[PDB]
Design a protein around this ligand. Structure first.
Ligand SMILES: *[C@@H]1O[C@H](CO)[C@@H](O)[C@H](O)[C@H]1NC(C)=O
Ligand SMILES: *[C@@H]1O[C@H](CO)[C@@H](O)[C@H](O)[C@H]1NC(C)=O
Ligand SMILES: *[C@@H]1O[C@H](CO)[C@@H](O)[C@H](O)[C@H]1NC(C)=O
Ligand SMILES: *[C@@H]1O[C@H](CO)[C@@H](O)[C@H](O)[C@H]1NC(C)=O
Ligand SMILES: [Ca+2]
Ligand SMILES: [Ca+2]
Lengths: 76, 307, 97, 97, 49, 49, 102, 51
């Protein structure tokens, strides 16, 4: 649309302030696509994924690598 | 052709007219320029001290380097939290890099940078008219939650961006007085512990040399009549008017001016819609407004009576 | 002319052939420190910004929306346009139908 | 707006330092003969009275002139372009002429 | 009338029958957060004061 | 002076939320059909548009 | 008790919060009577004026308090490779609503 | 040495006393000679003034 707006794959044009803002506003998540690396109050998985701090040692696998339930990081 | 290594680049002492003691002195922090052309009120200040780098020149955030007052001069190292910025009240700091800093300030008539709560304890103030500028056709103290979202240009908080460059030159002689000693009717020069010094001296004739110990020179009496300055100072220094130019003033380097003025989208207030009333050949607009708001009318004909 | 619009001029922003005629006077230094005492005229760009009046976006007759970069005036009416149209023969129908 | 940058001054003590011309915008160069400059460290060189200082002052563009700048243009006779929505029968034609 | 003295009216200060014609326009929320964008005429009491 | 209190907004998603008249002083009510509110914690309801 | 200014700020300083909130409010220097003054004199006419009572036991009206609605944290959701899961914090119960298919 | 203002305050920061005193005094920014300045320049005319 306008040069001050970002167009997603759904044909909906959102504001440029909503691009890389940490929240998904388009139905395909294209506003959060690419962007830059976000610094992670949040647990960091071994492959770089960021999860909430209450997800660590919750008894369920949340990382793609499964780093949350690893015995090296989570101590019994 | 621009480098950002900063190992080959050093701070310096500057002369700004209003020190901490309300008289012009030499300070390790000296404001050369203030740029205030950002729509969000953030200003960019050039300071003779380097920010974000340690004594050795390695990029170390939250640490700044500066020239010292001692005559065996070196480049001392201190914490960034001691740097305070104020125009009329305290300024919030947004970014720092070598010679440059970006800060959000209230309106005022002068801009000062100080090193508070330290061994130095120095301040430098310059005259700069900072006014509360706004975007659009309606004034606002703060941007609204919801508005029109018009284009406006602000300084980028990231230090990776560049808005031009500053030229960097090799430094000239400094000629410290403590490298002289006038005992009886003869003059001596004492270099520091190990460092070589260069003297050029005109007791009766111009004779120059490089020494590393206390040496006699001719038979002249007064210590005014010659000097001594250390050589091998090949660290690039900004071409500030407070420094003597070297014999070779070729531009040895260029360094970026950070915090580029980039276009973003920022909200501006939408005023109350005026309650228009109509008569035979005109309209009255009621125009409720709190802050000043621009009303512009023009006729759609040959003679556009623009008000 | 110093103090007016067009103190500094160049063909482009990156051009190395820049001209300027501000009123720079270099005073004689009279202090202990090394110092370059200079006096200069106020920037005429700033003076023109202070006294710019109003843009053509608010003054242009016939309601001409002035738009910038491929500079033009859009959506305004001051006269009449003669139009000669060549209608295709397939659009017409015979008078019987 | 211009930057009016002042280069680091050059002193020659017991010497003469006349300066040549330069291509910089508004190059003002002036020679002073009775200077005894100081820094943090005392007098700058040896020679008592007959000195010289080279005050230099030229003009360059401000760092923020990529955005905040004005372009001066000479315009001429202006061509006009019209988009037409013309309908005939049951056929609609949009065309820019 | 909005903006003039007498925007809000009641028989008493503790009365529950309060009538007003302050010109409130409720704008469309165009931001991320939950918001009620409203614009209004000034108080006629303050304008009269 | 009037207080011009704005109540907490009501949102209904994949539904219609027309409002009735009220006896409050200068009661202005308006319905918006394209919202997606955000509190501290993300989106506030499931229905996309 | 505040000086005149253009805005009002309430802040939490030197803590884990460290957060300020500022609202535009034009605070004028209010004077009583037919002379203007920065400070009340030691001696004057002693005329009637209305001031805010410092004791919190007094009341000048009431504010209405309602039950809170849903708040809908996004940290209660996990997005898998092709499905979603809903997990509560600790042993609390969470009401979920989904209308993706029904 | 004070900035311009409309009152003068002497206070005892912290301590047992911890008290202040403010009086009404119109402190204005004064300038020597016949041209306005916030701060004295590095180089000027060096005229007589009483401090
Ligand atoms: C400079 O000082 C060094 C000390 O490392 C010494 O070796 C050298 O001879 C000195 N230079 C001259 C020219 O004397
Ligand atoms: C700016 O323009 C106004 C006219 O509105 C004038 O009063 C003022 O002196 C101007 N300021 C400068 C710095 O020239
Ligand atoms: C246009 O359409 C109408 C009804 O759709 C029809 O009666 C008429 O004949 C059509 N005209 C032409 C020129 O095809
Ligand atoms: C609420 O949580 C408690 C504790 O986990 C659980 O026993 C209970 O079944 C849940 N539901 C209700 C309706 O109380
Ligand atoms: Ca987004
Ligand atoms: Ca987990």
């Amino acid at each position: 649309c306008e040069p001050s707006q970002f167009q997603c794959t759904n044909g909906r044009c959102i504001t440029l302030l909503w691009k890389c803002d940490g929240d998904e506003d388009c139905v395909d998540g294209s506003d959060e696509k690419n962007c830059v690396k976000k610094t992670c109050s949040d647990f960091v998985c071994n492959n770089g994924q960021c999860v909430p701090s209450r997800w660590k040692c919750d008894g369920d696998p949340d990382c793609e690598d499964g780093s949350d339930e690893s015995p090296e990081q989570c101590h019994m | 052709s621009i480098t950002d290594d900063f190992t080959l680049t050093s701070p310096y002492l500057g002369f700004c007219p209003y020190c901490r003691h309300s008289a012009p002195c030499f300070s390790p922090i000296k404001i050369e320029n203030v740029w205030d052309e950002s729509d969000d009120g953030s200003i960019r200040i050039q300071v003779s001290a380097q920010f974000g780098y340690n004594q050795a020149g390695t990029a170390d955030v939250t640490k700044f380097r500066y020239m010292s007052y001692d005559h065996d001069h070196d480049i001392k190292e201190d914490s960034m939290e001691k740097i305070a910025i104020s125009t009329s009240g305290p300024c919030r700091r947004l970014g720092h890099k070598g010679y440059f800093l970006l800060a959000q300030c209230p309106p005022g008539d002068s801009v000062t940078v100080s090193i508070t709560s330290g061994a130095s304890e120095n301040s430098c103030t310059v005259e700069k008219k900072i006014r509360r500028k706004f975007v659009g056709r309606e004034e606002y103290l703060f941007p609204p939650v919801q508005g029109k979202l018009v284009k406006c240009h602000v300084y980028d908080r990231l230090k990776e961006t560049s808005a031009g460059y500053i030229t960097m030159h090799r430094p000239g002689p400094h000629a410290y007085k403590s490298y002289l000693k006038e005992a009886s009717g003869e003059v001596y020069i004492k270099p520091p512990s190990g460092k070589n010094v260069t003297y050029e001296c005109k007791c009766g004739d111009y004779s120059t040399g490089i020494v590393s110990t206390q040496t006699k020179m001719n038979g002249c009496t007064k210590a005014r009549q010659c000097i001594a300055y250390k050589l091998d100072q090949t660290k690039w220094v900004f071409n500030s008017p407070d420094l003597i130019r070297h014999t070779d003033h070729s531009v040895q380097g260029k360094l970026h001016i950070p915090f580029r003025l980039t276009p973003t989208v920022c909200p501006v207030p939408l005023a109350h819609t005026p309650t228009v009333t109509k008569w035979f050949k005109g309209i009255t607009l009621h125009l409720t407004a709190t802050r000043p708001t621009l009303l512009t009318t023009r006729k759609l004909g040959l003679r556009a009576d623009a008000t | 002319k110093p103090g007016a619009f067009g103190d500094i001029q160049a063909s482009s922003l990156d051009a190395t052939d820049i001209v300027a005629r501000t009123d720079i006077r270099l005073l004689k230094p009279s202090v202990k420190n090394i110092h370059v005492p200079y006096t200069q005229a106020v920037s005429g760009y700033e003076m023109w910004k202070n006294n710019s009046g109003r843009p053509l976006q608010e003054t242009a007759p016939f309601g001409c929306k002035i738009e910038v970069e491929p500079l033009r005036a859009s959506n305004c009416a001051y006269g009449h346009i003669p139009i000669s149209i060549d209608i295709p023969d397939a659009a017409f129908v015979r008078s019987s139908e | 707006k211009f930057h009016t940058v002042i280069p680091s001054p050059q002193v020659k003590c017991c010497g003469s330092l006349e300066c040549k011309a330069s291509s910089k915008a508004d190059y003002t160069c002036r020679v002073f003969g009775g200077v005894y400059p100081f820094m943090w460290g005392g007098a700058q060189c040896f020679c008592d009275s007959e000195n010289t200082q080279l005050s230099e002052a030229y003009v360059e563009f401000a760092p923020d002139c990529t955005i905040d700048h004005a372009v001066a243009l000479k315009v001429h006779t202006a061509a006009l372009k019209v988009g037409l929505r013309i309908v005939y029968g049951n056929t609609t034609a949009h065309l820019d002429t």
